Design a binder for this molecule. Structure first.
Ligand SMILES: CCCCCCCCCO[C@@H]1O[C@H](CO)[C@@H](O)[C@H](O)[C@H]1O
Ligand SMILES: CCCCCCCCCO[C@@H]1O[C@H](CO)[C@@H](O)[C@H](O)[C@H]1O
Ligand SMILES: CCCCCCCCCO[C@@H]1O[C@H](CO)[C@@H](O)[C@H](O)[C@H]1O
Ligand SMILES: Cc1ncc(Cc2csc(C=O)c2C)c(N)n1
Length: 178
């Protein structure tokens, strides 16, 4: 019914995030453009918070069980491959249920959710990845740069794609019965 439709959409966007995560996205070392965020963001914005959290969760789990996650420790895996991708669901708080679709909430929702995801990577960068800190850099400054810049680039890409979607396919962002 409504729920079968909702569950299928969650599953498809999680599998799509995963499939897109296979596209090489490295800019320089762990500075990356995470375009794989976008189907979770779209899902969160169309179907709301809970749907998005769960899509994030399923994507994280696929990353791990398929071997495509970089795992250093249990707690680090939990932080970066469960919490971080789930955290994209916060975009669901900016869902629009009624037309016309406004651009500003799409962009606010995306910004806040990518920010929150890369805030957890930033925290992880400090805790788990400091042995890789560039010559002359403190851990915090190194994680801030790497994850600050990845966050920004990820949001740029998420904005380019979702802006195109808002202008050419606005109904993607408004769930409709019927
Ligand atoms: C499924 C819900 C949450 C549980 C997540 C389970 C995924 C655990 C996967 O572990 C990792 O798998 C890699 C190869 O599979 C190994 O190379 C790696 O050493 C190991 O750490
Ligand atoms: C609720 C589950 C959260 C995700 C599950 C994570 C399981 C992956 C655990 O990987 C292993 O953890 C050890 C540290 O404890 C590392 O020494 C080891 O290298 C690593 O391979
Ligand atoms: C030192 C040679 C390596 C490159 C030199 C320029 C980049 C060095 C990073 O500077 C950063 O500036 C902050 C205060 O200035 C510190 O809090 C931070 O820990 C530090 O890492
Ligand atoms: C310095 C630093 N290097 C690597 C990672 C790990 C990482 C960055 S983005 C991302 C998306 O999955 C992961 C696993 C980190 N947090 N900080």
């Amino acid at each position: 019914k409504f729920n079968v439709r909702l569950l299928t959409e969650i599953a498809f966007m999680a599998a799509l995030a995963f499939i897109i995560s296979l596209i090489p996205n490295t800019v320089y070392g762990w500075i990356i453009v995470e375009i794989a965020c976008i189907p979770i963001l779209l899902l969160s914005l169309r179907r709301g918070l809970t749907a998005g959290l769960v899509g994030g969760l399923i994507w994280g789990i696929l990353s791990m069980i398929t071997g495509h996650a970089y795992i250093l420790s249990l707690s680090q895996a939990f932080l970066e491959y469960l919490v971080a991708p789930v955290s994209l669901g916060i975009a669901g708080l900016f869902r629009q249920k009624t037309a016309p679709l406004k651009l500003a909430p799409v962009l606010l929702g995306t910004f806040v959710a990518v920010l929150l995801k890369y805030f957890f990577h930033f925290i992880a960068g400090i805790i788990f990845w400091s042995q890789y800190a560039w010559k002359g850099w403190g851990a915090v400054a190194y994680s801030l740069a790497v994850n600050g810049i990845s966050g920004i680039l990820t949001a740029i890409a998420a904005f380019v794609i979702l802006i195109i979607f808002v202008k050419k396919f606005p109904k993607l962002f408004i769930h409709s019965n019927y």
